[PDB]
Design a protein around this ligand. Structure first.
Ligand SMILES: [Mg+2]
Ligand SMILES: [Mg+2]
Ligand SMILES: [Mg+2]
Ligand SMILES: [Mg+2]
Ligand SMILES: [Mg+2]
Ligand SMILES: [Mg+2]
Ligand SMILES: [Mg+2]
Ligand SMILES: [Mg+2]
Ligand SMILES: [Mg+2]
Ligand SMILES: [Mg+2]
Ligand SMILES: [Mg+2]
Ligand SMILES: [Mg+2]
Ligand SMILES: [Mg+2]
Ligand SMILES: [Mg+2]
Ligand SMILES: [Mg+2]
Ligand SMILES: [Mg+2]
Ligand SMILES: [Mg+2]
Ligand SMILES: [Mg+2]
Ligand SMILES: [Mg+2]
Ligand SMILES: [Mg+2]
Ligand SMILES: [Mg+2]
Ligand SMILES: [Mg+2]
Ligand SMILES: [Mg+2]
Lengths: 50, 71, 79, 76, 64
RNA sequence: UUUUGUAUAAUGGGUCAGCGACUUAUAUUCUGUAGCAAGGUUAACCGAAUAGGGGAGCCGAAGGGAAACCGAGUCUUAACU
RNA sequence: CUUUAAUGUUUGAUGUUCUAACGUUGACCCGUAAUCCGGGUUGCGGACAGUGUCUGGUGGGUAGUUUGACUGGGGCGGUCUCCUCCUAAAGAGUAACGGAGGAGCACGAAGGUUGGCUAAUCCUGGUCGGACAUCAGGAGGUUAGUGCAAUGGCAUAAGCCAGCUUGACUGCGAGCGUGACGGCGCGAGCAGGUGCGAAAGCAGGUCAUAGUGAUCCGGUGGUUCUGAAUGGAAGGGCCAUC
């Protein structure tokens, strides 16, 4: 198991996060995706964090 | 906390209904601090609920029977 | 390893430390192969074979980080 | 020996045969590949499961240019 | 003497209106990254003890 | 008696007579029966003491929710066809 | 303020010396008529030794215990969960220390959509070029390919290429399949927001079936839900998660 668990924090200022996995060797870049925030009910860009 | 049946309001006293007037009628325990009057039975006498937390549905029954509710 | 002093003494300290680690690794290999030669033996009756000794041998594979990097050869192709 | 292991049975196969009066959303057949295909008023899940899309009798047919077995539901 | 209740089994079951018991689904404590949200979301509400295990719980809770 | 299975060469008993093994509190659930019935019933205790008092309490007539809380509805949910 | 320097200055360490605590299984006297004990003069060690509490190490000297199951007797060897095929007797299911193989992952594109395309192998000709490299046209009709075993499937392609994106969304869910249960799986549709497409529509991960671990105990972030006289807080509870 070379993939490690990472969490996609929400940039909307609220405390909400998804959780996925990422091979930090092949992809050392920082993920960002437009996902849904149930707290705000809007699509906001999520950036990865520990 | 306890629940007061509507039909229990005919067994209390000459009409005033507070916490103490119910503990005299043995309807609630001696350590009860709050109570509620829910729509469960049927009320005929014009009862005056002094301080309690009657529900919306039971409030209409008390007034329709001739009573009045306060805090 | 915070070392107090100058470069000249720390160099000798590092060399002595490396020599000690080499000796300890060699001793560990000796012990590993001896316990392996014991493991490969038979049972010789309705005897124990020592499950505790088996577990203690299996624990003895804690792995070693080779010093690595330590570049000492480079390739300049002929012209 | 070296072998001697298996895997639990998966209990596939047709569940509602021909002529069954089924309810909406009821599973009609579980399968691994696509043995039967989805016809009218039926669907196909990710497992290639065929489920009723509306209640009614099941009908099996071999329509198609490649002679493929289809499952459809009458509105009865 | 009074029947002792199984204190451990009184922290996981509540007696509902008719006489059944309700409990909390398992498999939702940790390792929550693999699990699909559809599977997780179905585990969030409470459930009812099945008829097979009802006889076993009634014995454990004589008073509740 | 124990077993798939015993005339079994599998176990036990020499024979008579006497003794010898599912009991007794408490608590809980279900059935039958009796009394009262949206009510039923007292405990300790008092008592000329199996009567009569004592209603402290316990169960039941309202449930939902983890809880605050709401209440013939309640919880989930931004809200539910 | 900035680098130090000196005497006072509390202490900290270190060593030397002393006696008064302490030791005396050194001598002498008394109780006494007694190599016990006590008391008294003295000598010698002396704040060391020794004892109490706390603490690190050693400790089969001693004590309590554990040391799995299957098994063509036990031990030795082998196995223990999950996936695919046969045994399996044309619904499901079905055992053996029966016959053959795999898993404990991968992917930020290898997912979603909108366009587009169709393989293996052989023949003939053609620079270094050949039995087989790229090119041209004929046969061939999926004998080809799939992220990794086997089976089922795939041309409307599930196989190959490109553009744009994040539905690898949140709350639910009619109704079914499968389990003794814990549980596992499939699912149209409803509400909020989103991507692609002119639109009809498709999208709640990957062609499907392996890629996994209940509870307890804790950790991290949010939430007035509670907060033991009241106002807070601690600790709990709920959601996400390790
Ligand atoms: Mg009372
Ligand atoms: Mg949790
Ligand atoms: Mg026998
Ligand atoms: Mg015979
Ligand atoms: Mg004989
Ligand atoms: Mg005999
Ligand atoms: Mg015998
Ligand atoms: Mg005999
Ligand atoms: Mg009496
Ligand atoms: Mg209730
Ligand atoms: Mg001696
Ligand atoms: Mg011992
Ligand atoms: Mg013991
Ligand atoms: Mg055994
Ligand atoms: Mg054997
Ligand atoms: Mg079969
Ligand atoms: Mg059978
Ligand atoms: Mg793919
Ligand atoms: Mg296409
Ligand atoms: Mg694709
Ligand atoms: Mg696949
Ligand atoms: Mg307080
Ligand atoms: Mg907290």
């Amino acid at each position: 198991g070379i993939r490690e668990k990472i969490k996609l924090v929400s940039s909307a200022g609220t405390g909400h996060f998804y959780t996925t996995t990422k091979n930090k060797r092949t992809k050392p870049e920082k993920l960002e995706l437009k996902k849904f925030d149930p707290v705000v009910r809007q699509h906001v860009i999520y950036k990865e964090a520990k | 906390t306890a629940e007061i049946r509507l039909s229990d309001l005919a067994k209390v006293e000459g009409g005033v209904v507070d916490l103490n007037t119910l503990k005299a009628a043995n309807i609630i325990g001696i350590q009860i601090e709050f109570a509620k009057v829910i729509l469960a039975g049927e009320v005929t006498t014009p009862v005056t609920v002094r301080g309690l937390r009657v529900t919306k549905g039971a409030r209409a029954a008390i007034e329709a029977a001739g009573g009045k509710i306060e805090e | 390893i915070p070392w107090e002093g100058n470069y000249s003494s720390w160099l000798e300290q590092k060399d002595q430390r490396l020599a000690q680690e080499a000796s300890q690794e060699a001793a560990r290999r000796k012990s590993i192969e001896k316990e392996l030669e014991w493991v490969r033996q038979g049972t010789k009756g309705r005897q124990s074979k020592g499950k505790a000794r088996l577990a203690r041998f299996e624990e003895l594979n804690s792995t070693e980080y080779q010093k690595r990097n330590e570049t000492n050869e480079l390739f300049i192709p002929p012209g | 020996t070296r072998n001697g292991r298996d895997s639990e049975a998966k209990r596939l196969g047709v569940k509602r045969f021909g002529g069954e009066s089924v309810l909406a959303g009821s599973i009609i057949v579980r399968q691994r590949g696509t043995k039967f295909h989805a016809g009218a008023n039926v669907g196909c899940g990710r497992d290639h499961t065929l489920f009723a899309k509306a209640d009614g009798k099941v009908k099996f047919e071999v329509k198609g240019p490649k002679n493929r077995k289809f499952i459809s539901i009458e509105a009865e | 003497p009074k029947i002792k209740t199984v204190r451990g089994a009184a922290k996981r079951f509540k007696k509902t209106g008719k006489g059944g018991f309700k409990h909390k689904h398992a498999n939702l404590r940790h390792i929550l990254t693999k699990k699909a949200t559809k599977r997780k979301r179905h585990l969030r509400p409470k459930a009812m003890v099945s008829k097979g295990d009802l006889g076993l719980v009634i014995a454990c809770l004589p008073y509740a």
